[PDB]
Every structure is written in C-alpha cells, then in structure tokens.
Amino acid sequence: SELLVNTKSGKVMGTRVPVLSSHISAFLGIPFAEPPVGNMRFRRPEPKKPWSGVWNASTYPNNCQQYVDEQFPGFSGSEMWNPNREMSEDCLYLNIWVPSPRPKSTTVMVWIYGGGFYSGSSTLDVYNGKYLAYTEEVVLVSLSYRVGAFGFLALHGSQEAPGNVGLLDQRMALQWVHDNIQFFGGDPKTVTIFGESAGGASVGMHILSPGSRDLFRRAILQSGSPNCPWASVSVAEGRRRAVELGRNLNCNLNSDEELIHCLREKKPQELIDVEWNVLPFDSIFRFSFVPVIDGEFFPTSLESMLNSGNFKKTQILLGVNKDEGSFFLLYGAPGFSKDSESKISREDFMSGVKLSVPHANDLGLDAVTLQYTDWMDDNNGIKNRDGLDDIVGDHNVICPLMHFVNKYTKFGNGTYLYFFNHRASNLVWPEWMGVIHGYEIEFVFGLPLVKELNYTAEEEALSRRIMHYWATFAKTGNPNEPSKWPLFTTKEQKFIDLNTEPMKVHQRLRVQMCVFWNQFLPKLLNAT
Amino acid sequence: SELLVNTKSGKVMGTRVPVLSSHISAFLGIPFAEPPVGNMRFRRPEPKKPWSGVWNASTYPNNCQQYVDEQFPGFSGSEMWNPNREMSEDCLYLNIWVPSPRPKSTTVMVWIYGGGFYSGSSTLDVYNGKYLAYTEEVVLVSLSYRVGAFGFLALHGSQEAPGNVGLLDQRMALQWVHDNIQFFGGDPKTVTIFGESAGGASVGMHILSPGSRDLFRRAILQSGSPNCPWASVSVAEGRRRAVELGRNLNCNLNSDEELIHCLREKKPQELIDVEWNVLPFDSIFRFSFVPVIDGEFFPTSLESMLNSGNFKKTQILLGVNKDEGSFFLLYGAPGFSKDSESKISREDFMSGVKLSVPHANDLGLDAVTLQYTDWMDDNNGIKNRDGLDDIVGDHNVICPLMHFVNKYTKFGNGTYLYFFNHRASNLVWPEWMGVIHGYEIEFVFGLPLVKELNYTAEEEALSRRIMHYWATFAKTGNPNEPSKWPLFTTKEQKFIDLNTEPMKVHQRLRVQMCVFWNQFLPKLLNAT
Ligand SMILES: O=c1ccc2c([nH]1)CCC[C@@H]2NCCCCCCCCCCCCN[C@H]1CCCc2[nH]c(=O)ccc21
Ligand SMILES: O=c1ccc2c([nH]1)CCC[C@@H]2NCCCCCCCCCCCCN[C@H]1CCCc2[nH]c(=O)ccc21
Ligand SMILES: *[C@@H]1O[C@H](CO)[C@@H](O)[C@H](O)[C@H]1NC(C)=O
Ligand SMILES: *[C@@H]1O[C@H](CO)[C@@H](O)[C@H](O)[C@H]1NC(C)=O
Ligand SMILES: *[C@H]1O[C@H](CO)[C@@H](O)[C@H](O)[C@H]1NC(C)=O
Ligand SMILES: *[C@H]1O[C@H](CO)[C@@H](O)[C@H](O)[C@H]1NC(C)=O
C-alpha cells in the first residue's frame, strides 16, 4: 500500500489527504528522537529506538512546550502562530507530505519553524505542506526542535545542559531525513533546508556548522540569518541567563549540577512563566534562550567563520520583507497599538530607539537617531513610526542578512536575493504594520490557491510564482526555468522585488543604512 | 566747498567722482591710526595725531602687507582679490563715499574686508562704494586693518604682541566713524557694519565684544560668523604658532621679548613667505594668524557668550552662498583644478575629507564620509566632487552661521536670513565651482548696474533688489519697504533664496547636515 512505508526506524502508516480537489499522502508525527523528558531535559537528543509493528502517522504530533501569545485573545493574526496542538516536552517529531503516486527520487524540502528560538510548531495551518508538495511535486518535510530554556539553556562545560540542543534536535531530524527519505520517494542527494526568522538563522547555522553540512544540499533563508544580533549569545551570557533563570525559581545556585537538578524538577510552565525575566536589557527583538557560540557546533566566532570561508559552499536563495520590525514594535514599544495608526511622538521615537539597540551607549543612540530622523519635520508622527519600523527591521533582519549574503557570495556557488513587498489584500493586522515579518510564508506555502481564504487572483498568481521559484531552486540550484531572476554577485549585487507587479531588478539592497549598521555603528560602539 | 570737510582729526579734501552718468564725492585714504611701523609692529593701534593743513584724500591708500595670490597669473577671477595698490605696513586708512549734495544725516554702512584674516584691501574694484552710496543714498565707508602676522600674531601676556590688534584696528576705524561721520553728512546713530567671510566673522566679533558694541547700530554678516572653526584660536595655539613663526626665521626663542624683537627686524615679506608653515595640520580652510580668545576683546569663550546672551542685542541680516567650499578645494585639495570638471575619485574624496576636518580622529572622519557618500553610486566623480564641496562649505561657513543665528535670535531684536544661489552669467571660474564664496559681493556693491561689465538685465535687477534690501535694513532694521522677506524666528526659522527668480521662502536652512556638524560630530570627537 501507498500509505505504508518501511524505514530504518520501523514501519510507518500514513493517511490520504485531499488537496485542491486531488489527493496526496501525509505521514504525520514520525518520531526521530527519544522523548527528551525527565533527566533528559536540557540534554542532547538521542536517536529514537526502532520499533516493531506499525507507527500510526495519521495525526499531527504534540507541539513543544513554549510561551503562548495571548495579547489578542481570538485574533487570527496572532493566534495563527500559537501552538494548535497540546504542548508536551515529548515533541520531537517530523511530518512528511508525499506526492501521489509515490515518487521514486524527487527533490526534498525540509521546513524549520522559527519564532525567535522561543516558540514555533510544525503543525500550524500556515505550515500545511500539502499545497506545496502537491503543486511542485516535491517531498515536503517539516521538522520540530525544542525551543526556549528546553532547547537552549546553556551552561557551557556541563554535559547535562551544554546549550544548542535545539539545534542538535534539528540536525537529528536532518540525519533521519538523509537516512530514510529515499523510502518515501525523496532524493537524499537533493535536500533543501528552508526556514523563516529563527528558522532562517538555523538554516545558516547548519551551513556554518561542520557537523551539519553533509546532511543537505542547498538552502533557503527567509528574513533571518545566523549572524543576527538576537540569534546567538556567548557562553558567558548563556551561563549568566541560566543562573538568573535558576534564581527566579529559587534554585540552589552552588553548582551546575545543583542548578540543573532544580530546573529539571520544575513543571514546563514554571520555566516559561519567568523566561522573559532573564534578558539583560530593557529591549525589543531579543530572546532569552538562543544558540551559544560554543567552540563545538560553531568552531569559532560566526564572523571569522564567515571571513575565512569556513562554511558549506553551495547555492542559497534568501531575502527579506519590507517591514520586518513592525511586529516587534507593536508588542514591545510605547506608543504602538493594534487598533490605532500608531503615530509616534519624538519622545516615543527616542525611547523606541533605546529599546531597539539595547547594547548602545549614548553616542551610539544619538548616531541611530540622527540617521533615521528627518530634521525638517521631526514631529511628524507617521515618519517617526515608520523610521522606528525601519530601525528595528534594518538592525535585526535586513542588514545582518545583507552582511551574510556578501560574505557568503565570495565563496559560494550561487546566490539569489529577494525583497518581498506585497501587502496581502486580506491581512487582518493594521495598515501601519505594512509587509510584516512572517507574512511571505503563506505565499511560500501556497495558501492563496485555496479560494475560501479570500486572496485575489493576482495573489494566487504570486504564490504560484514563488512556490515554483522555491522548488525549482531546490531541485536545480537556480529558481529560473531553463523573465529572469538574476544571480546576486559580488560586483553587481542584484536582487528582485517579489510582488504582484512585473519583476523589477535592483542593486545594493538598503546599502545606505546597512553601511551604518554593519560598519559605522559597530566601529563607534567599539571606540567608545 | 562740498569736497572740503572738517573733522576732529583735521581738514580733509575729497574728490568728485562720476557714477552712472552722475557724480558723488569720495574721500579716500583718510588715516585713522598712527602707522604701525617699526617698534609698533604687532602692537595695538594708536589714534592718528591730528594734523594742521589739508589732508589730500583724492587717492586710494596703500594696502596692508599680505600674501599675494599668484596661482593664475593674469586671471581675473583670482587677481580681483589681490592688492591693487602698493603694499606697506603704513596702511591704516579708511575711504568714504558721500552722496552729492552732501546729506545732513543719512544712514551709514561700513564695509570690513575679509580674506581669511590673512589678506584683503579696501581698494579692490569689487569694493568700489560709489554705486551703492549713489543708488541708495547712504554714506559708505570701507575701513582697513592689519592681516596676517602683522594683525594677529599672538603672544598672550605680552603687551608688545598681545593678539587681536587687527580687530583693534577695525574698532579704531569704527571709533573714528562714530566720532566724525556727522561732518560728512552721516548719522552716527545709524551705522551698520557689514562684511564678508573673515569680515562677516569680524562683524560678529564686534557684536560680541563689549568694547565695540556701542560704536554701531546694526549688522550684516555675509558667509562668515564669529564662531567659524577657522576664525579664532586659543591663546595657547596662538602662542605656539608665534613661536613656530619665530623658529622658521631663525629667531632666538628664549623670551617673548627676544622673539618679538627678532620678528620686528624682518622685512614684511620674510614673514609672509613662511606664514603657511605654522599651521598645525595638513588642512584646508585654516589660516595662520587669526583672532585669539583672550579674556579681553572676548571676555569668555564664544559659545558661553552666545549661550548667556552676552552680546549686543539689535537686528542682523546675514546669509550664505550655495557653494562656499569650492574656492578652497580648487586651491588646496588633490584632484581639483581650474580647467577641468574636477571629477573626484573615491580616493581623492577621502583624502579631501581628511584635509577638511583636520581636528578629527578616524571615527570622526568615517562619520563625515558616511554622511556625504551616496553608497549606491560611490564611484560617481560628480557626486564625489559635489559632496566634498558641501562638506567644506557646511563645516566652515553654513553650519557655523546657522548655529550663530539660532543662538542670536533667542536674544536679538530681529533676524533676516538669506541663501544666495545665483551663478553669475559672466563668471570666469569653472562651472563645477557653482555659486562661489565671495561672489554675492559684486551684487551687493552694484557692479551689475555698469553695462560694460556684461551682466544680464535680470542680474542688474537682482543687484538693485539686494542693494535696496541691504540699505533699507541698515536704515530701519528691516530689509522690506513699508513681496516680503520674512523675519527669521526661533519657531519658524524662515529664510529666502536670493536669485533672479520670484522670491521663495523656506525653513530650516540645511538643518539635516547642520545637526551633524553642530551637535553630533562634536559629541563624537569629545567622547573619543
Ligand atoms: O514558527 C513561528 C512562530 C511564530 C512566528 C513565526 N514563526 C514567524 C512570524 C512571527 C511569529 N511570531 C514571532 C514574533 C511575534 C512578535 C514579537 C513578539 C515578541 C514576544 C513578546 C512576548 C511578550 C514579552 N513582552 C515584552 C517584554 C520582554 C521583551 C519584549 N520583546 C519584544 O520584542 C516584544 C515584547 C517584549
Ligand atoms: O577681502 C577679501 C580678499 C580675498 C577674498 C575675499 N575677500 C572674499 C572672497 C574670497 C577671496 N579669497 C580668499 C579665499 C581664496 C581661496 C582660498 C585660498 C586659500 C589660500 C591659499 C594660499 C596658498 C596656500 N596653499 C595651501 C597650503 C596651506 C593650506 C591651504 N589651505 C587652503 O584652504 C587652500 C590652499 C592651501
Ligand atoms: C559552481 O561550481 C561549478 C563547478 O564547481 C562551476 O563550474 C560554476 O561556475 C559555479 N557557479 C558559480 C555561480 O559559482
Ligand atoms: C524689538 O524691540 C522692541 C522694543 O524693545 C519691541 O517692541 C519689538 O517687538 C522687538 N522686535 C523683535 C523682533 O524682537
Ligand atoms: C491511528 O490513529 C487514528 C487517530 O487517532 C485512528 O483513527 C486510526 O484508526 C488509528 N489506526 C490504527 C490502526 O492505529
Ligand atoms: C593731491 O593728490 C593728487 C594725486 O597725487 C593731486 O593730483 C592733487 O592735485 C593733490 N592736491 C593737493 C592740493 O595736494
């Protein structure tokens, strides 16, 4: 039977699912690691022990334990990112969508979720892989990994909570896909890993990490890169936040063993309830437990690895959205709110810049303010709101990604860059937020092809172009079928806009502001 | 007789001169101080001893000893600023143009020349006061003062060469106008001092200095202000440059008395020949001997005097030209030349910025470069040439003047601001230089009214509007006759363009760049 597949871990039984009035197979909730529960909390993952009998893979797995957004109860805009399954520390599973009839050797795409390393589920409705697997004929895999303290609490030196285990969870799922995807009709030599936000940073982290490089072929990064300022911390800061988490839960702090034992006895929700208390600064776009530059998963600093070409050399396709920062300002800066146009006074602009560049002295804050203020009209509430939106997006997503692409391209085998700036006709978020962080995902996953969702015909057409670009790139290393999306090169630095208008090619994506964030501001903070 | 006037210093006999097919009287070369020769070189001026008999004032006086531009032998563009009379240390004289018939009590305008405190003559053809005195019916006075080492060598503490004597020369001529102008038909209670470049800085210096304030009524500053970075030095730097001048002429350096005696024995040209050797840095728009913040002519720092309102409170009319920096780049920065379009490579742009902000560390130079570079087109030779032109002009003239006007307006009785951007149809300098430092002077002095000079009819019309604005302001404290030039206010910050097109009013003259030069860059250089 088509729904029965034999893997090196055992037999798995899928389920048939309808898609655009046709059908494909889905294998949901396949375990790839042992449950990281009890004394395994915080430890590296262990491979799932093989089972006899048939694993029922007809239903979505539990989501990992994480913070749940309840800022707008019932609002679809926020709730579409929340876990939609019961949460459990027993959550290391992957999902596979397989074209019907079962392919023999087809391109594989593996999706990595990415809510800032503190949230995410492989089961969200915007991540339903059937539309993409069906439309582009690819085997689509979505994996999972521990987030928050469970995936990134880091006490370097300890083997009990070494840090980066959530990245080791992703790697284990990639090891499993590499070792078993052929039985599902996927080509193990043509696997593309792709992810958005923390998922985009994760993808870049597997490109960098020696131990992950051989498990995949190509990569796609959406609004995220490994060098993002929020994507990693030193082992000293990781240690400091682990100790502070311990202090918040009245743990004995005399030894790593003492701290970890105490943290292992707390119910999951006790850890999540105090997670945001360990940030070192009053800030925005900063998360508590994230990857650590440990000397193992990352052999040296990200920047020296990037400079010396110490990374997998292959093709990459990546890009950003027009208003990456709005989501974070709404949720964490004074003067912004969901139901108003959020016109910001000079005063709120300045407290917003301080929140956005937490690691800055007064001189650095003045440099940012001067750079984004129109001095002939400094009390313009709209310009203040938008300038702050650009500050958050440029500093946290765009300029770090531009620095990664320029460094990568020097040694890689082909780079395609995009700038997504289409505001969906049916967005439920306010107008001032623009093209929000995360809202290109629905186009990548094909949601506009389902009429009940209410997109315009031109949006369905953009979704089809995007899915075909992502799949053709996954399959060949070039998004174009043999109107051209040009290669990004060190000399020309070309990229394309991705929207409902005829393709336009441009050069040097936000160079002006990115020289400020990647070259001047850091020199400034280092001198002072 | 109309050409005979009795003053407190003695009888003076003028000469009748033709002007626009009419005639007026001129009294040229009236002495106002004793010749500052021999043991008087470097000393404060002494009032001219009265004489019996008639002083023949029918011919222009000698010009003070100064550097002579010979970069373009015979070129009118440069030679029009060079002394056109024999040079002599015996040069403290003033010139007066008096309407015919002799007025009884009319508005007086006193012109202060201004070639960077190192050059200037009251006798230049562009300073011929007959057109203005005739057309606007004012008594026009041009004074003179020692420039270079002769006027500003400063060894604070010594009474032999105290510094600022060139400013004391100007003040003595103002004392003489105040005491004697009534005999020429001028109103001593309505005297306006006006000057360009160092002359504009000098005018602001008499507004600041307690000892000069009571000698005049109102003020006009053209492309120059007291707080300009090149307009003054501390007593420690003045002392250092005096000692270095001594060292260049193999002087005994053991005591001030020894140094001064040696310097007094050198012929004038020996001092001028090594003048440029004492600058402390490789630089542009920096002059060797300039006013010193001494605690006497200036009681405290210029900035605290400005902040506390320690200055004459009256009306002022002032402004700048569109391309103040080109003159200096032509003469002192690599890649610029008179007969080419001077397209500047990135390399020359960067060595030009280093020359323009001599007092800057690497971080400060990076801040300037980032501010004036268009990163999407950094190899554009035209943008590089023009960005450097704006850097020199903004830093040396425009932003210092904007800072002076905002501070002054808080305590003054009326401010009128202009931005002169008309490129004369007959300019002999190349196109790339634009509206050059000093080229509004010919319009202020009415040269476009003389047909043989070849200006267009609309230029003659602009000249008439400008002369009438300057004279009406001198007479009433408002350039407008009772199309309006609005008052510059702390809140609105209005100014007008001055050119051949219908008047346009704007706000916040170069605010964007001036926040960089007046607030950010200094904070930057101070922190580092
Ligand atoms: O797989 C996933 C799962 C979720 C998401 C995706 N992907 C991609 C699109 C985005 C989506 N949400 C993440 C971002 C969703 C928007 C950004 C929200 C940040 C988390 C706020 C939680 C409350 C903490 N309140 C304050 C105090 C602590 C510091 C702080 N910092 C701030 O940046 C904002 C608020 C606060
Ligand atoms: O009364 C006057 C008399 C003259 C002038 C006015 N007014 C108003 C208009 C302008 C006119 N010329 C002054 C500026 C005329 C243009 C500016 C020229 C500056 C002096 C250069 C002399 C040579 C010294 N050569 C180098 C080495 C020393 C440092 C250095 N620094 C530089 O800024 C340029 C060159 C050099
Ligand atoms: C990719 O690599 C192949 C062989 O290693 C080479 O022929 C090709 O030019 C490369 N393409 C790019 C864009 O570097
Ligand atoms: C100037 O001063 C007079 C009297 O001191 C006052 O009535 C007038 O308003 C002032 N004008 C300005 C522009 O300050
Ligand atoms: C497996 O799970 C689904 C849902 O819980 C159930 O409907 C299905 O019949 C089960 N199949 C077997 C044979 O376990
Ligand atoms: C004074 O000087 C001028 C020129 O040197 C001369 O022509 C004129 O006649 C002289 N007048 C007297 C009486 O000194």
Coordinates of N, CA, C and O and ligand atoms in Angstrom, one line a residue, chain A residues 315 412-414 487, ligand 3:
Chain A
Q315 N 24.5 26.6 -3.2 CA 23.7 27.7 -3.7 C 22.7 28.1 -2.5 O 22.4 27.2 -1.7
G412 N 30.6 31.1 -2.1 CA 29.5 30.2 -2.6 C 29.4 29.8 -4.0 O 30.1 30.4 -4.9
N413 N 28.4 29.0 -4.3 CA 28.3 28.6 -5.7 C 27.0 29.2 -6.4 O 26.6 28.7 -7.5
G414 N 26.5 30.2 -5.8 CA 25.3 30.8 -6.4 C 24.4 31.4 -5.4 O 23.9 30.6 -4.5
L487 N 21.4 36.2 -10.9 CA 22.2 35.8 -9.8 C 22.8 37.0 -9.1 O 23.0 38.1 -9.7
Ligands
LIG3 C1 29.5 26.5 -9.4 O1 30.6 25.4 -9.4 C2 30.8 24.9 -10.7 C3 31.9 23.7 -10.5 O2 32.5 23.7 -9.2 C4 31.3 26.0 -11.7 O3 31.6 25.4 -13.0 C5 30.3 27.1 -11.7 O4 30.8 28.3 -12.4 C6 30.0 27.6 -10.3 N1 28.9 28.7 -10.4 C7 29.0 29.7 -9.6 C8 27.9 30.8 -9.7 O5 30.0 30.0 -8.8

